[PDB]
Design a binder for this molecule. Structure first.
Ligand SMILES: N=C(N)Nc1nc2ccccc2s1
Ligand SMILES: N=C(N)Nc1nc2ccccc2s1
Lengths: 202, 195
């Protein structure tokens, strides 16, 4: 008897939540978390303050869901760029994935939300857990494929993956906080080329 | 003097807090316990430290000073004959020093949480970036690393070294994790060193 009512209220709640996340991603992406209040976000999203209260305990809870949706888009955008790269070998896929990370992390919205705001708002523990949840699988599979092809030494995948994600996250943070980010991106790309080319047999 | 008495009170509290937080972690020991360990009244303690985080900020300074000194000592004693070998010795020194139980708990686990992102990174940079940039500069000068600005390489390598230490710190089998991580780090830097 009550399944349509329950599903209807679920769908309405989901639509409200999506509008708030979409609004918050847009305004915080342009001005930064510190500079935009939840009332402006509720106005942008076309929802009441009570609808906001119902969905999110507080401003940081809304930000935690923004980061989830952005990280899903970052991982999808990176997969698209590697897929489109023309990579002939697992080693070339790895190089395409590093290039994709510098391109996607360079998007001004990703820079603001993931590299500048997220470490501050989530705290160090929260940021590291999100980055590993989204990126460890892709990174490990790229390593497994290169090992299978004899382009990387046979070794435990997890330690290498975690160390490389540490290096790549700090590379992107360096570019994000540079006052001349075009020069920083060149210099950082050049470092990562030497690091990756030092490890790959191909 | 009044300044000497204040300094003695502060030293008792920083020593006590370093000992107790180093064993159980910041979250698990309150300021009353620390004041009892130090033999200091609550009022004398709050006169020197506004709150728990303030006391932790001074613990982090004395631990970072020991990390920096122990890193210098071990690299100096390694017998490294070239800048490339000093870099290799610094990698092994970092796994030895960061494996100290007090460093593991206070610097690797607690400091990023208590000080916050910006705070912890400012402290770490103040104590480390001197040694790090000198090691890199000497290797570039010797032609054992590519010609390049120092800072970008330093930040990327610090990201690898920090994640290596945190991997070991939370591992189910830290002795195994340290062997696996040492192999990864030595292979990463051997790919870039000419010598
Ligand atoms: N990682 C830290 N949080 N602190 C330090 N690391 C190092 C590493 C080498 C030399 C001095 C220092 S101080
Ligand atoms: N500064 C950091 N955030 N961490 C580290 N710096 C250094 C520098 C040299 C060796 C190990 C490490 S670990």
């Amino acid at each position: 008897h009550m399944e349509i009512k329950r599903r209807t209220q679920e769908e309405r709640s989901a639509a409200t939540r999506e509008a708030l996340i979409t609004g918050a991603r847009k305004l915080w992406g342009l001005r930064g978390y510190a500079e935009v209040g939840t009332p402006e976000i509720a106005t942008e999203a076309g929802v009441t303050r009570g609808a906001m209260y119902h969905q999110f305990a507080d401003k940081a809870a809304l930000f935690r869901d923004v980061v989830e949706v952005v990280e899903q888009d970052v991982m999808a955008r990176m997969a698209t760029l590697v897929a489109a790269s023309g990579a002939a070998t697992p080693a070339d896929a790895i190089r395409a994935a590093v290039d994709a990370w510098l391109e996607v992390s360079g998007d001004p919205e990703v820079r603001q939300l993931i590299l500048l705001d997220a470490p501050v708002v989530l705290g160090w523990a929260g940021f590291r857990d999100v980055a590993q949840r989204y990126s460890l699988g892709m990174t490990e599979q790229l390593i497994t494929e290169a090992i299978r092809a004899g382009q990387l030494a046979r070794q435990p995948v997890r330690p290498l993956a975690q160390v490389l994600i540490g290096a790549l996250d700090e590379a992107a943070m360096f570019i994000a906080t540079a006052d001349d980010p075009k020069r920083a991106r060149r210099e950082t790309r050049q470092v990562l080329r030497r690091l990756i080319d030092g490890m790959l047999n191909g």
